[PDB]
């Protein structure tokens, strides 16, 4: 059993049948989102009712629906009609990716724009880009995708090298009308290729790297039971998978002697946004919610042994729905392994003569996804000493434009005539805290400087302070790297042996948050991304910092709406949302394919244990 | 042949023989410091004379001396008497460590303080602690160590568990006088032991950890020639070792096509200080410059295969002088290895159908040192993509105190009665830059937010600005994490194919800098630690941010004196000094032996290459 087990191919086919028989899955319907619902609070005495939540899109434009289905009983529990002009459009479907390019290929404004630039339509790729919400009054209630063009010179060519600037199209994918074709001027299409597998670009391959062999003679130290339940060096957890969020960790706990102590109830990356900083109207509207608009889990890669994942790997192969409700297995979509992590603790003592050295290790659960030109690896780490860590790895090909003659304040030049507009990748981690159980609170810790004076006559003293966040209206926080600011999640009703409330300290990377003007559409639609830390009271339906239907929604859904409830968070069931991101001014070294850059955060035990928890590690 | 070769055992004897011949190294003399001198500029082309610099301590108190000698010519190049009362005492000798406990063991005042607490003198360890510069007029012209006591109940007991608070003693280690014994009250000596190899505290050791086997069947991809010259995956450099700074990197360069391109001429950790923030008179004077006062290189551990350095390791065994001028080999004091570093670049393309993955690696050069309760690992990494990184790893046992009844604002409780005063560990990296050669300049790069308005009507635009630091007076910089501030070192006379100055970008961790009041003794003596970044014009004698003689030296030397000369740094031979540190509020988890915490920095190529430099890495 386990009410936390991964969705099976059978459950997904059951959802399909159930929907099909209740009349909700006609020829014109598409599954836009499908995932398992988590167990409600309490509810632990009751046997599984496996439920699935489903967004049904209608290609004719009739109303979409949100449907909840019980798989154990074979019934629709509810179906609600969606007013998308109110609550937002449905996520972008894989099959809609093509539709932008095909619709445009017969539009005469588009054909004429290509003809002016001497581009063969059969060689012109169109990226299917989400819309946002700007000043275009005809777009309200229309399902829109925007289109930017890239030239592919041949089947295996990297079209990203050949952007067609000065030209953008807006397209109603439902009515199949091109609503606008905006041409602001021809710009040369950058000429050089970006084919990073072409010997002409690689030059001769290095023969100098000798193999590194990583093996585990006696197998790994972790177990997997029930399909997805891990135990490893005192840690216990379940590894979930959602087509929108990707890997999601459930019931993170740590064995302290006799007791299994809970730390985090659910951890996920609940949204991520890529806002572009170029004020040209070709691009000034682009802001991709890869998570909320495109759904990152659906494009999770199959990870190749010795290539994506090196060493003794245990795979999970999550199953998702396609657009028709058929199960699709993502084979080896999640890697799980343990690795050596250097020195954990070391001391050679001058008085005892004892020399002591122990090594560290971490458990790694990861996947890797691809959304158009980006690729992102999501990695969770658990260490021996109780630390939890997340890390995002951003690679792929940068999104390109022309580089204007006489330069730019908003774009980098990567190759002759080729630009890469400035942008950010900003993630939100939603951490439903359970530090020794659900009664938690958050404190903001600052370092406190002290003035030389009485009490401090040498002027060496320094201290720190902690401020409990008591209500949601005062739980919207910014980083302050100058005063070493962190946030402690404690349990005021579980004390360690020194009679202090047990806790975990969140260490942020303190990177810039959203740069856009606060009056922008993006600052409203991705308000989560303007502050580094938010604390909300737990509620079942408060899932994403951006709300449930991100595509084309007007603003303030999600975290600003939740926080407006101004609920008690002081010693309550609470959820922490940490914003963290990369601000990317691309470099020549990022072209034609980019070296991984990274960002993340970590949580460390802060008086959680009664002493170091790693004294029982052997040499 | 190598002008950058490590010191040999012969070279060291040679210096002792030359000093002996000169009448400089009689029986009352000690070598407090000895290292090889780096070639002067335009040299190896002017001369190639092999030279050594020595600080000679005199155990009778006559003035010490600084002496430069040529080991090839067998001559003294210069010798100067040191007025230690003005320019600073010499580094503390390993052989002075026991002197403090020894002199106190027969002092009536110390014996009376111990009696009052019911402590057997034979059981009481005293830590030999640097003295700094405070308000004690009898200290002028005296070589002082201060002492703090810890009880050791048996030969293998960790005495750190048993601090004897309320008591401190000052000792003139040359005249063998105890100058003061301060007793502010009896404090219970904390009772629990902290013996981390004791099964009482360990519990049964885990049997769950399976082995991880890391091997290189065909050997490592790097070569080592000339004893310390490394070449690895396009990188080239020389690994030096100095008794004060530890491992030092020379001539870091990167082969780009048919040129060896310099990046960094010399890299080192040129100081690191541990200031304490407890206002108790027992501790308010403590600030240990483990580099400048104690010499971290001295205490470099012999590193054991498996255990300290895992995988296929090539060791160096640098050679240092003893206090008598005899060579002493630090067997296996430096580990060098390469290691797999996860994904380098990855992309699955929706149009070309090509899936591409490359793995990263890094070359690691490290040592690990022990200073008292103290252990630090210094790690330099070079990545395949051009990135250079430093990491410091801090572990050991925390410096303890009593925990006062009624709590503390400057001290954490670790065990019943057992305190750990708040302190920082702050490092200074001295980076003698050579970006494509010596003509370098530094630019401070801030993100620029833009106001919604004409030219940015949607309010999405963001940019950045870069400010050339032209003169030393302008080049004392602070971090600003909110505006994502970094510093670019570029060569205005060396342009990439896009006609931009080639450069490297420094990414700092933006941790708190020195917290002490700006009027404190420590703020002046560790002035480098109060700012994140400084830039100086290269000068042979400008070596340490704290000057040559740190022990009992007031402010007046080092980085603020260098800066005052206000030299041109815009397209010149320049040196970057980067302050970074950990602010340590100890936690229960740190006791009785602390898990590694880390801090560091990195430099990444910024338009240095003409495209990615890792397109030639094999699958
Ligand atoms: Cu980017
Ligand atoms: Cu510390
Ligand atoms: Na919670
Ligand atoms: Na230089």
Author numbering:
A (entry chain A), B (entry chain B): 9 to 627
Provide passages from the article that reported this PDB entry:
Copper amine oxidases (EC 1.4.3.6) (CAOs) catalyze the oxidative deamination of primary amines to their corresponding aldehydes with the concomitant production of hydrogen peroxide and ammonia. In their active sites these enzymes contain a copper ion and a redox-active organic cofactor, 2,4,5-trihydroxyphenylalanine quinone (topaquinone, TPQox), which is a quinone cofactor that is covalently linked to the polypeptide chain. We have studied the CAO phenylethylamine oxidase from the Gram-positive bacterium Arthrobacter globiformis (AGAO). AGAO is a homodimer comprised of two subunits, each of which consists of 638 amino acid residues and has a molecular weight of about 70 kDa.
To elucidate the mechanism of the reductive half-reaction, an attempt was made to trap the reaction intermediates in order to analyze their structures. The reaction proceeded within the crystals when AGAO crystals were soaked in a PEA solution and freeze-trapped in liquid nitrogen. The reaction stage of each crystal was confirmed by single-crystal microspectrometry, before X-ray diffraction measurements were made of four reaction intermediates. We determined four crystal structures for the catalytic reaction intermediates of AGAO. Based on the spectra of the crystals with deconvoluted absorptions, we found that the wavelength of the maximum absorption spectrum of the crystal soaked in PEA for 2 min was close to 352 nm, consistent with that of TPQssb. Two peaks, 436 and 466 nm, arose with the passage of time; peaks at 60 min, similar to 120 min, were 436 and 466 nm, which were consistent with those of TPQsq. These results suggested that AGAO in crystals reacted with PEA during the time course from 2 to 60 min. We concluded that the product Schiff-base (TPQpsb) was formed as a result of fitting models for TPQssb and TPQpsb to the electron density map. We also found conformational changes of the amino acid residues in the active site, Phe105, and Leu358′ of a neighboring subunit that moved as a cap for the substrate channel. In this study the rate of the catalytic reaction of AGAO in crystals was 6.0 × 104 times slower than that in solution.
